[PDB]
Amino acid sequence: MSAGKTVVIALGGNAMLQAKEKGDYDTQRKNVEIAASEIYKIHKAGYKVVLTSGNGPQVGAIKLQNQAAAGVSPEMPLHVCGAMSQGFIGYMMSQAMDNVFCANNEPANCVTCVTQTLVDPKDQAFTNPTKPVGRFYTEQEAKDLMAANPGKILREDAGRGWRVVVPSPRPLEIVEYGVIKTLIDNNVLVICTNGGGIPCKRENKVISGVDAVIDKDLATSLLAKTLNSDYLMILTDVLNACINYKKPDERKLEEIKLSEILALEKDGHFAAGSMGPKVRAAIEFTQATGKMSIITSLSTAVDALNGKCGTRIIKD
Amino acid sequence: MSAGKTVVIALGGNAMLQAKEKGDYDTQRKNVEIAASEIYKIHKAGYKVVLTSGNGPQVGAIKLQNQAAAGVSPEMPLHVCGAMSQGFIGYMMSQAMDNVFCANNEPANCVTCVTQTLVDPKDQAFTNPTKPVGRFYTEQEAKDLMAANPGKILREDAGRGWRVVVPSPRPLEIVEYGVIKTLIDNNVLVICTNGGGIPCKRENKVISGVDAVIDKDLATSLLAKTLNSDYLMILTDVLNACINYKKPDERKLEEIKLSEILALEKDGHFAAGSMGPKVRAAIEFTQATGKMSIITSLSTAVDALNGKCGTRIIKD
């Protein structure tokens, strides 16, 4: 609706996969219906919505299929695989999103937009692959897989297993920003930058895909500020940022000033952890716009917009 | 730009795969860049443009890939491969379009929208698969392939080749129509309906995918009609629509009235070849809207708009 503030919301892996679930279509779709239903409440509450997501498991699978079927069908580059994954994931989200609309007697206007993200060709990440993608292997399967493929390489995800990593450079620009803004201006629920957008580079007037996978969160933060949006939510499965998890003095984070959190991020309280970039993302945005950023669970998304829970970082 | 008439254009395979081309990314990319530079002329000429395409080779490849890797990663249903092919084609296209734009120092605003298309689960298409996707096999390979894979069907196609074949029900409803309009109203070069849109059904107010590949020409006609576009433009490599070619009495359709070409279709003149559904779709547009439809080669697209060539179907 013409009156609403804009919120840029970044769905996580759990919007598609639950802890160690299998990625058949029907599984992922059901979890996407679950998230749509929570997202709809925010739109019903009158906010304008931009929806992003990650694609770790999904892009990983596409790449796996491209390699497995290589002798029988030409194998696509990683960046092409991402494009396909946005097609997959975007379709699920918009279809689920349309279905809840219709269940609530609202006519559907929501689209997924294919999204390219510009990055730096000389990013350190292009000489040192950080980002986990696909499903988990085991050391034997993993430490082997550099047997036929020395160029491929896996890494510790602590207990759950061994995962392919790849360049994860800094998002510099959302190529489609202008069109996304135009859509929200018109009260369209936009789905975009799924998996952080197709990593690309631009030199001498030409854009072309690079093999990589960008950070969802940093990308979303990037978008939210270029959009100068009102809120940024990252939605995890942790209803909450915690200092000192597993501790007598575990302090759960709520509505925090920019001061403490930005300091805690050099008590390095989030360094090693799934929540590192999630914090930086939030800080980066609040820091840049003075607007509130939120980190909370899918379950409590509206609740956190109404100030009832979630970590919400606040301007100083 | 605000005052342009709207032309809805359907790219073919030539946009991506030539004869006897192998479907690696680099090959498709360069082809798409060819189409793009042509398409840009039209935009530059002041038209508002909606670009669509087929996905036959591409969805076919994605399907082949899902079958072949079914033991290494969950196989997706055909409609999901559809979504995936949109991700891929939309990416090549809008990245290509963005590059013509920039080479010409005009800042980009082009997007690709994931598109769903409603169809009837009770269509004859389903009982009887007839739409060719993927690559051509020799007649032997098809024999063998079919033995080895009972469910699968191949048919001779284009005179030279056997191909996997799928349901191709009528398109009834471009789900994201409202948004597509909004974007062109705001002068966005819009790419959507790639491969004819993701085949879905709606029962009890729930949209879900069906396993099929819609005719892109029929789908583009529907969208052009819903949009109340000024022109429907179908692209090919076939110069023109010719009745009896390499047959002394050859009659190559140019400008022509509805009722006239109407009754040739009644007389089975386009009974074979690719042109049957192209004319049918062109007829459907002009019958409903009275606006001109156009069947011509990529190379002569601007030429056609400028009333100087190609098969131009006209209302009586």
Over its C-alpha atoms, chain B yields an Rg (Å, rounded) of 19
Q: Of the listed A48, A216, A225, A291, which one is catalytic?
A: A216
Q: Indicate left, alpha or beta for B22 from its phi (over 0: left) and psi (-120 to 50: alpha).
A: beta
C-beta atoms surrounding B46 within 10 Å? 10
Sheet containing strand A231-236, edge to edge, reads A110-112, A189-194, A48-53, A6-11, A231-236, A293-297, A311-314, A256-257
Which residue from B minimizes the CA distance to A188?
Answer: B179
B257 flagged as catalytic: no
d(CA A270, CA A281): 12
Residue tagged 């092919």 (tokens)? B85
Q: A5-17 burial by CB neighbour count: b if 16+ within 10 A, else e?
A: ebbbbbbbbbbbb
Q: Which residues of A touch B95 (CB under 8 A)?
A: 116, 200, 207-209
C-beta atoms surrounding B151 within 10 Å? 6
Name the nearest CA neighbour of A28 among A63, A60, A50, A2: A60
Residues 6 or more apart whose Cβ sits within 8 Å of residue B218: B170, B171, B196, B277, B280, B281, B284
CB B214 within 8 A of CB B119: yes
CB A94 within 8 A of CB A110: yes
B223: three-class secondary structure by DSSP: helix
B87 flagged as catalytic: no
Alpha-carbon A258 to chain mean position? 22
Q: Of the listed B12, B48, B82, B131, which one is catalytic?
A: B131
Tokens of A161: 């297993």
d(CA B72, CA A307): 45
Which residue from B minimizes the CA distance to A57?
Answer: B73
Helices first, then strands: H and E counts in chain B: 10, 17
d(CA A242, CA A238): 9
Shortest distance between the Cα of B80 and any Cα of chain A, in A, equals 6
d(CA B126, CA A120): 48
Tokens of A301: 């998304």
Residue tagged 């036959």 (tokens)? B56
d(CA B34, CA B100): 10
d(CA A132, CA A153): 10
CB A177 within 8 A of CB A224: no
Q: Which residues of A touch B86 (CB under 8 A)?
A: 87, 91, 114
Phi and psi at residue B273, in whole multiples of 5°? 70, 180
Q: CB B110 to CB A179 under 8 A?
A: yes
CA angle A75, A78, A82 (to 5 degrees): 110
Burial of B225 (0-12, 13-18, 19+ CB in 10 A): buried
Residue B256 β-bridge partners: B313
Tokens of B311: 């098969």
Sheet containing strand B255-257, edge to edge, reads B110-112, B189-191, B48-53, B6-11, B231-236, B292-297, B311-314, B255-257
d(CA A233, CA A176): 21
CA dihedral A64, A68, A72, A74 (to 10 degrees): 30
CB B207 within 8 A of CB B200: yes
CB A161 within 8 A of CB A136: yes
d(CA A92, CA B209): 10
C-beta atoms surrounding A66 within 10 Å? 22
d(CA A232, CA B2): 33
Is B18's Cβ below 8 Å from some Cβ in A? no
d(CA B94, CA B91): 6
Phi and psi at residue B295, in whole multiples of 5°? -125, 120
Is A112's Cβ below 8 Å from some Cβ in B? yes
Which residue from A minimizes the CA distance to B114?
Answer: A112
Q: Smallest Cβ distance to B69: which of A64, A77, A179?
A: A64
CA angle B144, B147, B150 (to 5 degrees): 140
- Provide the pairing of β-strand A116-119 with A311-314: unpaired
- Which ranges in B129-199 belong to alpha helices (H)? 139-148, 177-185
Shortest distance between the Cα of A103 and any Cα of chain B, in A, equals 7
Phi and psi at residue A156, in whole multiples of 5°? -65, 125
- Which ranges in B69-215 belong to alpha helices (H)? 78-103, 124-127, 139-148, 177-185
Sheet containing strand A154-156, edge to edge, reads A131-137, A162-166, A154-156
Shortest distance between the Cα of A151 and any Cα of chain B, in A, equals 20
Q: Smallest Cβ distance to A113: which of B76, B103, B111?
A: B111
d(CA B277, CA B265): 10
Which run of H or of E encompasses B131?
A: strand B131-132
d(CA A282, CA B113): 28
Tokens of A61: 């699978």
The structure was resolved experimentally with X-ray
CB A314 within 8 A of CB A280: no
Shortest distance between the Cα of B113 and any Cα of chain A, in A, equals 5
Tokens of B253: 């359709």
Q: Smallest Cβ distance to B83: which of A88, A109, A176?
A: A88
Tokens of A221: 């933060």
Q: CB B86 to CB A91 under 8 A?
A: yes
Name the nearest CA neighbour of B234 among B13, B3, B4: B13
Over its C-alpha atoms, chain A yields an Rg (Å, rounded) of 19
Residue A155 β-bridge partners: A163
CA angle A283, A15, A197 (to 5 degrees): 60
Amino acid at A121: P
Shortest distance between the Cα of B307 and any Cα of chain A, in A, equals 32
- Provide the pairing of β-strand B6-11 with A231-236: unpaired
Tokens of B202: 């709606």
B52: three-class secondary structure by DSSP: strand
CB B141 within 8 A of CB B148: no
Q: Which residues of A touch B74 (CB under 8 A)?
A: 22-25, 61
The DSSP-derived string for chain A is -TTPPEEEEEE-GGGT--TT----HHHHHHHHHHHHHHHHHHHHTT-EEEEEE--HHHHHHHHHHHHHTTTTSPPPPHHHHHHHHHHHHHHHHHHHHHHHHHHTTPPP-EEEB--EEEE-TT-GGGGS--EEEEEEE-HHHHHHHTTT-SS--EEE-TTS-EEEEE--PPEEEETTHHHHHHHHHTT-EEEEEETT-EEEEEETTEEEE-S----HHHHHHHHHHHTT-SEEEEEESSSS-EESSSSTT-EE--SEEHHHHHHHTTTTTTSSSTTHHHHHHHHHHHHHHS--EEEEEGGGHHHHHTTSSSEEEE--
Is B158's Cβ below 8 Å from some Cβ in A? no
Shortest distance between the Cα of B215 and any Cα of chain A, in A, equals 19
d(CA B153, CA B160): 17
Amino acid at A48: K
d(CA A155, CA B30): 36
Q: Of the listed A14, A66, A194, A240, which one is catalytic?
A: A14
Resolution, angstroms, 1 dp: 2.4
Residue B154 β-bridge partners: B164
Q: CB B84 to CB A88 under 8 A?
A: yes
Q: A161-183 burial by CB neighbour count: b if 16+ within 10 A, else e?
A: bbbbbbbbbebebbbbbbbbbbb
Q: CB B178 to CB A108 under 8 A?
A: yes
Residue tagged 């135009």 (tokens)? A182
d(CA B12, CA B56): 9
Q: CB B87 to CB A114 under 8 A?
A: yes
CB B117 within 8 A of CB B174: yes
For domain B1-316, give the CATH superfamily.
Acetylglutamate kinase-like (3.40.1160.10)
Amino acid at B135: R
HSE (side-chain half, CA atoms, 13 Å) at A146? 15
CB B121 within 8 A of CB B79: no
Q: CB A111 to CB B114 under 8 A?
A: yes
Which run of H or of E encompasses B6?
A: strand B6-11
Is B109's Cβ below 8 Å from some Cβ in A? yes
| Cα dist from A138 to A22, A128, A162, B144, whole Å | 16, 22, 6, 38
Q: Of the listed B48, B63, B201, B278, which one is catalytic?
A: B278
Q: Which residues of A touch B206 (CB under 8 A)?
A: 99, 102-103
A131 flagged as catalytic: yes
B216 flagged as catalytic: yes
Which residue from A minimizes the CA distance to B83?
Answer: A87
Residues 6 or more apart whose Cβ sits within 8 Å of residue B149: B67
Residues 6 or more apart whose Cβ sits within 8 Å of residue B127: none
d(CA B176, CA B184): 13
Q: Smallest Cβ distance to B114: which of A90, A178, A186?
A: A90
Is B147's Cβ below 8 Å from some Cβ in A? no
Is A70's Cβ below 8 Å from some Cβ in B? no
Is B90's Cβ below 8 Å from some Cβ in A? yes
Residue B52 β-bridge partners: B10
Phi and psi at residue A287, in whole multiples of 5°? -45, -40
Is B69's Cβ below 8 Å from some Cβ in A? yes
B55 flagged as catalytic: no
| Cα dist from A229 to A116, A197, A300, A310, whole Å | 20, 19, 20, 19
B165: three-class secondary structure by DSSP: strand
